[PDB]
Amino acid sequence: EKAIPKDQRATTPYMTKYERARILGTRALQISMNAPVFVDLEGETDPLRIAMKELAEKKIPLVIRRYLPDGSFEDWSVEELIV
Amino acid sequence: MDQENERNISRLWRAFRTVKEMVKDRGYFITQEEVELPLEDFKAKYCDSMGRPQRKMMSFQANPTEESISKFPDMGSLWVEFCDEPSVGVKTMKTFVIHIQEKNFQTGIFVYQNNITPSAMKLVPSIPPATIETFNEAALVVNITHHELVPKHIRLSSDEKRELLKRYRLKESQLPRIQRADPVALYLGLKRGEVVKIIRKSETSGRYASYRICM
Amino acid sequence: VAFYVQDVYKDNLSFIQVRIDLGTIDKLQLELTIEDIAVAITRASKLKI
Amino acid sequence: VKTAETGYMSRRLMKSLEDLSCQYDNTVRTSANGIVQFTYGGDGLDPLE
Amino acid sequence: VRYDNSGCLVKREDLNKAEYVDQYDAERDFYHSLREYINGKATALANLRKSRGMLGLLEPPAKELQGIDPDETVPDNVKTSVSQLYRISEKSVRKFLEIALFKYRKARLEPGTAIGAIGAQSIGEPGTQMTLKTFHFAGVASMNVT
Amino acid sequence: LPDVVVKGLPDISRAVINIRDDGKRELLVEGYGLRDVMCTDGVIGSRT
RNA sequence: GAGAGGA
DNA sequence: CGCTCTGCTCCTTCTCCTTTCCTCT
DNA sequence: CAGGAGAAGGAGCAGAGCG
């Protein structure tokens, strides 16, 4: 039920394609709602491209709650996840 | 006549070997030389003067081994008896269950010959402490566990089941159940709620373990 | 393995006669006798009356 | 004559296995959290890669 | 480590007892296959070496001559021939192992995959292309099959 | 009377001996008597 | 509503 | 020792399904 | 308009016990 502490977390340290797509979608939804960005914009306007560029530099400020079937859940930061 | 009697003798010998190995791999004490009994020995020690299958002598009692009684504290001796009358009815089954009760046996295996009256089946599952099981002689000719398509089953104790449930964080109602009266389940005689671990072999994946429970 | 079947009456009774030809039994090396055929008929008379 | 039968078979086959997911404990499970496989295919390897 | 069903550790004498198999068996088999493949390559190199004078050093040499070159007495001409025929480098072996391990850790069913839908489609869609072809039971024309 | 199954299994249409490769042979049966086929002598029950 | 392409 | 329930097992006669839709007319 | 597969009642016997 409680969050599994960071010291031991069985869930894979990798970033699944579903998690990557969901992170990009959430970050693009936030940016489309006039949210600050943490990358050099370079003139891009479509929020999805800005989200992709942020994920390229690991600048997306989100974490993943991987819900195990029992009920517990490991919180994995996007920065720590590998691609 | 001669051919029918000899065929029945050979079939009974194969059935007796199957029964011996079934009571062996459950954890009881038999010797490999006892199960590996040549047909000549079966004729010599389990037949009358004129050579007919008499079942009153081949019935036996088996007791657990030290390791199996350590793994399973609650496992008493069992009494394997055959029958003389083909159409087993209420009377013979009642005599057998009375004998089981008076002999202080935890379980008994009744290998009926040809047919079981449904009244006997009704009387079968009425014993609180002990239990009895029915095996057709035709159903025991080649043991199921030695077929090519039957993977290795293992009976898991309470401690092993608890370890498995804690490891996978599951419950007793989520594992892939195996029905009671399943031919590889009643072979091991799994009681309701006992986990069996299956060493399943596939050509693309080697061996791996899959777990089931008896329901 | 019947090789013929006949129905024969008598003065006050009737019956069915079938003579199993042992030649075909030997040539087919089947492991059965007259008693085996008779007991098979009696046991499979479930379909019959 | 085969198209309709194949379509129906595919429909019902999908209706059976509609909700099976590889959970984060590496066990294929159904919607009701009833574990059908303890590891996908015995190795947990996706055939796509 | 292959913990037993009771939670204890196998005593190194019954690891392959066929009653203690569990998950991570596929990974051990894959590692054994990798080791077997590298052993086959090294054995091929050693068998080439022993065919041209140089002793095949598949088994590790003793420490009584570990610090010295084990083939200095051999003429340098055959050394070049063996090198140009079969040469296995440290970088090549490390790169092969890294690539194999990366492609293995990549080739795992990622959690959350809708594996049920994938399986149902993979079993149903080929049915849409299974045109009825008449077959028999492996050379027996009479024994018709479906 | 001339249709009662005298010998065999009354659930089998036919049985044909087939010759496998490398000289082996086995019997292919059209019917539903698997348990009886495994039980009857002359065959190996572990592979049927 | 039901007649027929169509892929 | 036939007689009389139960119970089982056939046997017959019943019910619910048959891609995708994509148009026009 | 065909094909497939179950659920529900008659119906004909074994089986058990009996006064």
XYZ file of C-alpha atoms (C1' of nucleotides) in Angstrom:
641
model
C 0.000 0.000 0.000
C 2.713 2.443 1.023
C 5.319 3.699 -1.425
C 8.250 1.304 -1.735
C 11.408 3.165 -0.632
C 13.877 4.226 -3.309
C 16.678 2.057 -1.884
C 15.158 -1.139 -3.313
C 12.629 -1.017 -6.196
C 12.197 -4.223 -8.226
C 10.403 -2.545 -11.188
C 12.699 -2.284 -14.269
C 14.880 0.906 -14.235
C 14.138 1.189 -18.002
C 11.391 3.382 -19.500
C 8.655 1.448 -21.276
C 7.209 2.786 -24.515
C 3.815 3.227 -22.849
C 5.380 5.322 -20.087
C 7.281 7.378 -22.663
C 4.159 8.065 -24.731
C 2.140 8.949 -21.624
C 4.886 11.281 -20.365
C 5.064 13.019 -23.739
C 1.281 13.365 -23.854
C 1.060 14.759 -20.327
C 3.921 17.209 -20.860
C 2.432 18.365 -24.166
C -0.951 18.835 -22.488
C 0.691 20.930 -19.771
C 2.607 23.026 -22.313
C -0.532 23.559 -24.409
C -2.090 25.029 -21.243
C 0.567 27.788 -21.156
C 3.129 26.106 -18.938
C 6.800 27.106 -18.633
C 9.340 25.113 -20.619
C 12.849 24.175 -19.509
C 14.553 23.966 -22.925
C 15.677 26.418 -25.577
C 12.489 26.843 -27.588
C 14.214 27.378 -30.969
C 10.990 28.777 -32.418
C 8.939 25.584 -32.091
C 5.231 26.154 -31.476
C 3.480 22.771 -31.489
C 3.456 21.553 -27.857
C 4.249 17.955 -28.836
C 7.573 18.962 -30.394
C 8.466 21.012 -27.310
C 7.623 17.999 -25.140
C 9.816 15.773 -27.319
C 12.701 18.237 -27.054
C 12.277 18.417 -23.271
C 12.318 14.622 -23.017
C 15.473 14.598 -25.152
C 17.242 16.682 -22.487
C 15.517 14.929 -19.541
C 13.982 18.262 -18.496
C 10.397 16.995 -18.071
C 9.425 17.424 -14.373
C 7.234 14.347 -13.912
C 7.442 11.029 -12.078
C 5.787 7.661 -12.682
C 3.828 5.722 -10.055
C 4.262 2.131 -11.228
C 1.279 0.351 -9.660
C 2.114 -3.253 -8.831
C -0.837 -5.682 -8.716
C -0.653 -6.072 -4.927
C -1.260 -2.364 -4.359
C 2.184 -0.954 -3.653
C 3.898 1.437 -6.071
C 7.449 2.604 -6.854
C 7.826 6.299 -7.802
C 10.355 6.528 -10.675
C 11.609 10.012 -11.741
C 11.761 10.652 -15.484
C 15.338 11.890 -15.046
C 16.392 8.580 -13.477
C 14.658 6.424 -16.099
C 16.887 5.429 -19.007
C 16.028 5.355 -22.701
C -9.990 -69.937 -19.809
C -6.203 -69.884 -20.203
C -5.828 -66.791 -22.398
C -8.345 -64.649 -20.510
C -6.873 -65.622 -17.140
C -3.305 -64.897 -18.268
C -4.335 -61.542 -19.752
C -6.106 -60.611 -16.517
C -3.034 -61.671 -14.522
C -0.773 -59.441 -16.617
C -3.196 -56.509 -16.423
C -3.485 -56.913 -12.649
C 0.310 -56.967 -12.369
C 0.556 -53.719 -14.334
C -2.187 -52.167 -12.192
C -0.385 -53.241 -9.016
C 2.870 -51.706 -10.248
C 1.005 -48.475 -11.016
C -0.539 -48.472 -7.531
C 2.861 -49.076 -5.940
C 4.478 -46.175 -7.788
C 1.478 -43.929 -7.051
C 1.809 -44.605 -3.327
C 5.594 -44.242 -3.632
C 5.816 -40.779 -5.159
C 3.240 -39.495 -2.653
C 5.881 -39.905 0.065
C 5.278 -43.390 1.445
C 7.888 -46.109 1.915
C 8.331 -48.742 -0.784
C 11.513 -50.209 -2.235
C 12.423 -49.985 -5.911
C 12.787 -53.772 -6.027
C 9.243 -54.084 -4.658
C 7.644 -51.951 -7.378
C 9.851 -53.525 -10.075
C 8.189 -56.908 -9.644
C 8.501 -59.317 -12.602
C 5.320 -60.998 -13.800
C 6.671 -64.400 -12.741
C 6.953 -63.190 -9.140
C 3.420 -61.785 -9.352
C 2.163 -65.189 -10.495
C 4.153 -66.971 -7.784
C 3.134 -64.853 -4.785
C -0.234 -63.354 -5.817
C -2.079 -66.318 -7.349
C -3.811 -69.464 -6.138
C -2.882 -73.069 -6.935
C -4.706 -73.115 -10.285
C -3.553 -69.630 -11.303
C -6.295 -67.052 -10.781
C -6.060 -63.426 -9.591
C -6.830 -63.328 -5.869
C -6.893 -59.810 -4.430
C -7.186 -60.658 -0.720
C -3.394 -61.080 -0.489
C -2.070 -58.249 -2.682
C -3.709 -55.632 -0.444
C -1.076 -53.842 1.619
C -0.453 -51.012 4.071
C 2.105 -48.261 3.483
C 3.625 -45.847 6.010
C 5.389 -42.523 5.334
C 9.123 -41.952 5.143
C 11.139 -39.817 7.545
C 11.673 -36.955 5.086
C 8.056 -36.986 3.898
C 6.754 -37.142 7.474
C 9.045 -34.225 8.330
C 7.738 -32.210 5.374
C 4.122 -33.232 6.090
C 3.491 -33.700 9.837
C -0.133 -34.782 9.276
C 0.175 -37.832 7.032
C -0.850 -41.234 8.383
C -0.543 -44.702 6.926
C -2.761 -45.834 4.061
C -4.368 -49.182 3.251
C -4.561 -50.162 -0.420
C -7.052 -52.979 -0.969
C -8.609 -54.319 -4.154
C -12.024 -55.960 -4.558
C -13.196 -59.449 -5.491
C -16.712 -58.606 -6.731
C -16.762 -56.656 -10.026
C -19.953 -54.640 -9.414
C -18.924 -52.925 -6.192
C -22.024 -51.848 -4.295
C -23.119 -50.367 -0.978
C -22.353 -53.453 1.121
C -18.715 -54.006 0.146
C -17.923 -50.284 0.285
C -19.546 -50.095 3.724
C -17.449 -53.028 4.937
C -14.323 -51.342 3.565
C -15.076 -48.025 5.276
C -15.881 -49.799 8.557
C -12.529 -51.588 8.330
C -10.792 -48.270 7.620
C -12.447 -46.671 10.649
C -11.607 -49.560 12.978
C -8.008 -49.850 11.719
C -7.145 -46.184 12.477
C -6.047 -45.210 8.969
C -5.726 -41.645 7.709
C -6.632 -42.644 4.146
C -7.502 -45.639 2.015
C -7.336 -46.441 -1.702
C -10.052 -48.772 -3.005
C -9.171 -50.165 -6.444
C -12.503 -51.468 -7.696
C -12.474 -54.026 -10.485
C -15.057 -53.146 -13.130
C -17.913 -50.973 -11.880
C -18.973 -48.841 -8.911
C -22.569 -48.508 -7.780
C -23.510 -44.817 -7.375
C -24.653 -45.558 -3.812
C -21.064 -46.507 -2.998
C -19.946 -43.158 -4.429
C -22.537 -41.456 -2.219
C -21.127 -43.265 0.818
C -17.497 -42.537 -0.174
C -17.084 -38.876 1.005
C -18.584 -39.339 4.485
C -15.691 -39.740 6.953
C -14.581 -36.646 8.924
C -11.029 -37.681 9.949
C -10.003 -39.940 7.072
C -10.815 -40.240 3.368
C -11.105 -42.898 0.674
C -10.478 -42.853 -3.072
C -11.647 -44.989 -5.990
C -9.432 -46.211 -8.839
C -10.616 -48.311 -11.767
C -8.350 -51.209 -12.692
C -8.658 -50.106 -16.320
C -7.797 -46.546 -15.259
C -4.604 -47.926 -13.649
C -2.609 -49.698 -16.355
C -0.043 -47.044 -17.300
C 0.433 -44.301 -14.730
C -0.452 -40.854 -16.041
C 2.728 -39.195 -14.761
C 4.848 -41.255 -17.179
C 3.026 -40.026 -20.289
C 4.995 -37.714 -22.560
C 2.436 -34.889 -22.308
C 2.175 -34.912 -18.486
C 4.699 -32.512 -16.896
C 6.299 -33.175 -13.526
C 3.957 -32.261 -10.670
C 5.213 -31.552 -7.148
C 3.069 -31.314 -4.024
C 3.847 -28.178 -2.012
C 3.458 -28.134 1.766
C 1.887 -25.341 3.795
C 5.239 -23.605 4.313
C 6.118 -23.779 0.614
C 2.667 -22.489 -0.352
C 3.057 -19.602 2.098
C 6.497 -18.819 0.674
C 5.101 -18.819 -2.871
C 2.171 -16.585 -1.920
C 4.452 -14.105 -0.150
C 6.902 -14.151 -3.071
C 4.277 -13.403 -5.722
C 2.116 -11.361 -3.294
C -0.894 -13.422 -4.366
C -3.802 -15.058 -2.546
C -5.199 -18.571 -2.577
C -7.990 -17.428 -4.926
C -5.793 -16.004 -7.708
C -3.461 -18.854 -8.688
C -4.483 -20.901 -11.759
C -6.565 -23.620 -10.144
C -6.557 -27.315 -11.038
C -9.834 -29.166 -10.591
C -10.166 -31.934 -8.057
C -10.718 -35.323 -9.718
C -8.195 -34.252 -12.349
C -6.319 -37.402 -13.450
C -2.941 -35.954 -12.400
C -4.493 -34.444 -9.251
C -6.269 -37.496 -7.825
C -3.086 -39.386 -8.717
C -1.206 -37.348 -6.115
C -4.398 -37.124 -4.054
C -4.220 -33.370 -3.579
C -6.679 -32.056 -1.006
C -8.608 -28.837 -1.546
C -6.284 -25.863 -1.206
C -2.958 -27.621 -1.858
C -0.554 -25.972 -4.294
C 1.138 -28.106 -6.950
C 4.249 -26.831 -8.739
C 4.584 -27.927 -12.365
C 7.921 -28.211 -14.170
C 6.675 -27.432 -17.670
C 9.092 -28.005 -20.554
C 8.779 -26.136 -23.857
C 11.090 -26.389 -26.849
C 11.456 -22.601 -27.193
C 11.922 -21.835 -23.483
C 13.442 -24.828 -21.695
C 11.946 -25.676 -18.312
C 9.943 -23.288 -16.159
C 7.649 -23.512 -13.151
C 3.890 -22.923 -13.225
C 1.742 -23.197 -10.108
C -1.773 -24.538 -9.568
C -4.142 -25.082 -6.645
C -6.719 -27.808 -6.096
C -10.346 -26.674 -6.023
C -15.991 -63.957 -38.433
C -19.522 -65.377 -38.661
C -19.260 -66.840 -42.191
C -23.054 -67.361 -42.144
C -26.066 -66.817 -39.884
C -29.244 -68.909 -39.910
C -32.527 -68.991 -37.998
C -33.783 -72.513 -37.264
C -37.031 -73.572 -35.602
C -37.940 -76.875 -33.951
C -41.099 -78.684 -32.863
C -41.647 -76.349 -29.898
C -38.593 -74.043 -29.869
C -36.472 -71.862 -32.138
C -32.959 -70.436 -32.123
C -30.264 -68.669 -34.145
C -27.192 -70.584 -35.338
C -23.928 -68.909 -36.376
C -20.839 -71.022 -37.094
C -17.609 -69.102 -36.539
C -15.060 -70.160 -39.159
C -11.757 -70.845 -37.409
C -9.954 -70.417 -40.730
C -10.524 -66.660 -40.751
C -9.637 -66.430 -37.047
C -6.325 -68.186 -37.693
C -5.632 -66.131 -40.826
C -6.429 -62.903 -38.962
C -4.371 -64.153 -35.954
C -7.050 -62.749 -33.652
C -6.633 -63.725 -29.994
C -10.145 -64.911 -29.188
C -12.008 -68.197 -28.771
C -15.613 -69.388 -28.955
C -16.139 -68.535 -25.287
C -14.690 -65.071 -25.922
C -17.186 -64.489 -28.738
C -20.056 -65.773 -26.591
C -19.174 -63.567 -23.626
C -18.708 -60.609 -25.982
C -22.207 -61.201 -27.375
C -23.693 -61.476 -23.883
C -21.938 -58.333 -22.636
C -22.677 -56.273 -25.761
C -26.331 -57.380 -25.691
C -26.871 -54.006 -24.007
C -27.861 -52.770 -27.462
C -29.812 -55.992 -27.985
C -32.790 -57.069 -25.892
C -17.059 -18.332 -47.789
C -14.038 -18.103 -45.470
C -14.013 -14.345 -44.811
C -17.084 -14.301 -42.547
C -16.006 -17.317 -40.487
C -12.518 -15.873 -40.028
C -13.990 -12.540 -38.948
C -16.257 -14.153 -36.358
C -13.401 -16.308 -35.057
C -11.136 -13.269 -34.714
C -13.897 -11.336 -32.941
C -14.528 -14.003 -30.313
C -10.809 -14.747 -29.897
C -10.277 -11.067 -29.122
C -13.269 -11.065 -26.766
C -11.633 -13.869 -24.771
C -8.139 -12.355 -24.395
C -9.327 -8.734 -24.436
C -7.896 -7.718 -21.045
C -4.537 -9.359 -20.347
C -1.615 -7.191 -19.290
C 2.030 -7.755 -18.442
C 2.025 -6.366 -14.915
C 5.067 -4.710 -13.377
C 5.899 -7.895 -11.453
C 6.374 -9.582 -14.861
C 3.200 -11.680 -14.694
C 0.489 -11.735 -17.347
C -2.773 -11.065 -15.519
C -6.428 -10.559 -16.354
C -8.749 -7.720 -15.355
C -9.851 -9.428 -12.123
C -6.176 -9.692 -11.061
C -6.235 -13.458 -11.560
C -2.744 -14.487 -12.599
C -2.932 -16.604 -15.753
C 0.825 -16.774 -16.401
C 3.699 -16.225 -13.994
C 5.976 -15.149 -16.865
C 4.957 -14.533 -20.465
C 5.908 -17.557 -22.549
C 8.174 -18.856 -19.795
C 10.872 -16.284 -20.584
C 9.062 -12.939 -20.574
C 10.379 -12.136 -24.054
C 8.241 -10.149 -26.470
C 8.283 -11.857 -29.899
C 8.242 -8.421 -31.559
C 11.927 -7.886 -30.683
C 20.735 -17.694 -6.670
C 17.809 -20.127 -7.230
C 16.145 -20.092 -3.830
C 14.264 -23.254 -2.901
C 10.476 -23.410 -2.625
C 10.897 -23.246 1.161
C 12.978 -20.071 0.802
C 16.327 -21.721 1.560
C 19.393 -21.844 -0.689
C 20.252 -24.892 -2.783
C 23.450 -26.556 -1.565
C 25.348 -26.491 -4.902
C 24.855 -30.260 -5.209
C 21.190 -30.257 -6.313
C 20.983 -27.070 -8.382
C 19.760 -29.006 -11.443
C 17.580 -31.383 -9.413
C 14.618 -30.491 -11.699
C 12.547 -29.766 -8.584
C 14.079 -26.342 -7.839
C 13.535 -24.621 -11.196
C 11.851 -21.217 -11.130
C 12.041 -17.881 -12.907
C 15.487 -16.654 -14.014
C 16.038 -20.112 -15.524
C 15.700 -18.652 -19.025
C 18.319 -16.016 -18.203
C 20.723 -18.692 -16.953
C 20.143 -20.726 -20.118
C 20.810 -17.636 -22.245
C 24.042 -16.909 -20.362
C 25.110 -20.534 -20.807
C 24.375 -20.275 -24.538
C 26.480 -17.106 -24.767
C 29.341 -18.829 -22.955
C 29.002 -21.875 -25.218
C 29.165 -19.717 -28.353
C 32.264 -17.884 -27.137
C 33.800 -21.238 -26.172
C 33.122 -22.528 -29.676
C 34.863 -19.521 -31.203
C 37.842 -19.925 -28.858
C 38.001 -23.660 -29.602
C 38.051 -22.919 -33.331
C 40.932 -20.498 -32.764
C 42.821 -23.050 -30.652
C 42.309 -25.831 -33.206
C 43.627 -23.521 -35.918
C 46.620 -22.721 -33.701
C 47.503 -26.362 -33.031
C 47.392 -27.039 -36.788
C 50.309 -24.645 -37.412
C 52.848 -25.471 -34.704
C 51.705 -23.131 -31.941
C 50.238 -25.038 -29.008
C 46.525 -24.518 -28.471
C 46.185 -22.523 -25.252
C 42.459 -23.016 -24.686
C 43.089 -24.110 -21.108
C 44.815 -21.380 -19.059
C 48.581 -21.793 -18.695
C 50.235 -22.314 -15.338
C 51.651 -19.403 -13.350
C 55.171 -20.830 -13.758
C 55.211 -19.227 -17.227
C 52.285 -16.775 -17.090
C 54.493 -13.674 -17.102
C 56.518 -14.776 -20.136
C 55.270 -14.993 -23.706
C 54.121 -18.581 -24.394
C 55.005 -18.532 -28.110
C 58.253 -16.542 -28.411
C 60.155 -19.548 -29.786
C 57.672 -19.958 -32.666
C 58.734 -18.342 -35.971
C 57.025 -15.015 -36.592
C 55.871 -16.019 -40.087
C 53.323 -18.567 -38.856
C 52.250 -16.107 -36.147
C 51.188 -13.685 -38.878
C 49.334 -16.445 -40.739
C 47.406 -17.478 -37.623
C 46.667 -13.830 -36.826
C 45.353 -13.087 -40.316
C 43.247 -16.265 -40.371
C 41.614 -16.131 -36.910
C 42.198 -13.054 -34.748
C 39.919 -12.403 -31.772
C 40.470 -9.141 -29.901
C 39.477 -7.994 -26.431
C 37.434 -5.163 -27.936
C 35.562 -7.574 -30.209
C 34.661 -9.919 -27.341
C 33.596 -7.075 -25.049
C 31.522 -5.480 -27.819
C 29.860 -8.810 -28.631
C 28.986 -9.406 -24.980
C 27.695 -5.846 -24.567
C 25.567 -6.100 -27.716
C 24.144 -9.469 -26.662
C 23.294 -8.274 -23.153
C 21.767 -5.041 -24.472
C 19.627 -6.895 -27.009
C 18.532 -9.299 -24.276
C 17.581 -6.654 -21.707
C 15.806 -4.849 -24.557
C 13.897 -7.967 -25.660
C 11.709 -8.294 -22.562
C 7.947 -7.808 -22.627
C 7.608 -4.260 -21.333
C 5.110 -3.955 -18.457
C 1.696 -2.645 -19.420
C 1.753 -4.323 -22.832
C -1.697 -5.370 -24.049
C -0.355 -8.863 -24.639
C -3.836 -10.381 -24.743
C -4.925 -8.308 -27.732
C -1.600 -8.939 -29.478
C -1.970 -12.687 -28.998
C -5.606 -12.765 -30.086
C -4.814 -10.854 -33.273
C -1.688 -12.943 -33.925
C -3.792 -16.105 -33.739
C -6.869 -14.807 -35.572
C -5.508 -12.730 -38.452
C -3.505 -15.596 -40.059
C -6.778 -17.513 -40.073
C -8.104 -14.932 -42.533
C -5.383 -16.075 -44.964
C -5.618 -19.852 -44.365
C -7.029 -20.881 -47.719
C -8.224 -24.485 -47.610
C -5.395 -26.711 -48.860
C -6.022 -30.456 -49.017
C -3.586 -32.444 -46.864
C -3.163 -35.998 -45.579
C -1.490 -37.560 -42.533
C 2.130 -37.552 -43.717
C 2.027 -39.763 -46.794
C -1.115 -41.751 -45.926
C -3.588 -40.828 -48.661
C -6.443 -42.799 -47.085
C -6.128 -41.158 -43.661
C -7.930 -37.887 -44.344
C -7.313 -35.032 -41.908
C -8.771 -31.587 -41.278
C -26.721 -60.324 -34.405
C -24.020 -59.881 -37.116
C -22.951 -56.435 -35.922
C -21.985 -56.835 -32.241
C -18.356 -55.864 -31.657
C -16.720 -59.179 -30.797
C -13.124 -58.038 -30.265
C -11.627 -54.558 -30.046
C -12.993 -51.164 -29.041
C -16.579 -50.219 -30.077
C -15.600 -46.586 -30.668
C -13.204 -46.927 -33.631
C -14.000 -46.651 -37.333
C -10.714 -48.169 -38.531
C -7.002 -48.524 -37.835
C -4.181 -48.504 -40.395
C -0.509 -49.368 -39.945
C 1.649 -46.512 -41.247
C 5.391 -46.721 -41.894
C 7.379 -43.794 -40.540
C 10.730 -42.711 -41.910
C 13.916 -44.592 -40.959
C 11.968 -47.875 -40.903
C 9.743 -47.246 -37.883
C 6.005 -47.873 -38.011
C 2.980 -47.118 -35.854
C -0.786 -47.513 -36.011
C -3.122 -44.615 -36.796
C -6.638 -45.140 -35.431
C -9.829 -43.239 -36.285
C -11.876 -43.135 -33.098
C -12.149 -41.995 -29.490
C -10.602 -44.891 -27.564
C -7.413 -43.240 -26.287
C -7.557 -44.741 -22.794
C -8.180 -48.250 -24.124
C -5.462 -47.857 -26.770
C -3.016 -46.846 -24.039
C -4.141 -49.725 -21.817
C -4.001 -52.547 -24.371
C -0.727 -54.451 -24.554
C 1.561 -54.311 -27.564
C 1.888 -50.507 -27.469
C 3.816 -48.056 -25.311
C 1.420 -45.961 -23.249
C 3.975 -43.234 -22.565
C 3.824 -42.183 -26.251
C 0.292 -42.348 -27.673
C -37.090 -0.251 -45.571
C -34.636 -3.693 -48.935
C -31.742 -4.239 -54.663
C -27.190 -4.076 -56.277
C -22.193 -2.633 -57.378
C -17.657 -1.760 -54.260
C -12.756 -2.723 -51.814
C -38.982 -62.208 -2.486
C -41.097 -59.560 -5.592
C -42.352 -54.547 -4.720
C -41.584 -49.843 -4.602
C -38.961 -45.497 -4.685
C -34.515 -43.038 -5.894
C -31.149 -42.254 -8.928
C -28.684 -42.481 -13.238
C -28.348 -42.287 -17.972
C -30.071 -41.977 -22.456
C -32.957 -39.774 -25.747
C -35.563 -36.383 -27.736
C -36.822 -31.729 -28.412
C -36.285 -27.636 -27.870
C -32.795 -22.209 -28.169
C -28.682 -18.480 -29.788
C -24.853 -17.268 -32.876
C -22.952 -16.605 -38.789
C -16.579 -9.252 -40.590
C -15.563 -5.036 -42.144
C -18.665 -1.391 -43.553
C -19.579 1.969 -47.535
C -22.263 3.854 -50.714
C -26.522 4.830 -53.713
C -31.565 4.023 -54.801
C -32.630 -20.339 -45.153
C -28.786 -23.983 -42.947
C -25.273 -25.534 -39.136
C -23.656 -26.086 -33.764
C -24.557 -26.627 -28.747
C -26.172 -26.347 -24.948
C -30.950 -26.907 -20.932
C -34.944 -29.202 -19.874
C -38.326 -32.967 -19.453
C -39.923 -38.056 -20.459
C -38.488 -42.659 -20.073
C -36.297 -47.063 -19.214
C -33.683 -49.564 -16.337
C -30.005 -50.883 -11.999
C -29.841 -50.633 -7.096
C -31.132 -50.393 -2.590
C -33.950 -51.672 1.145
C -38.022 -54.105 2.938
C -42.089 -56.527 5.804
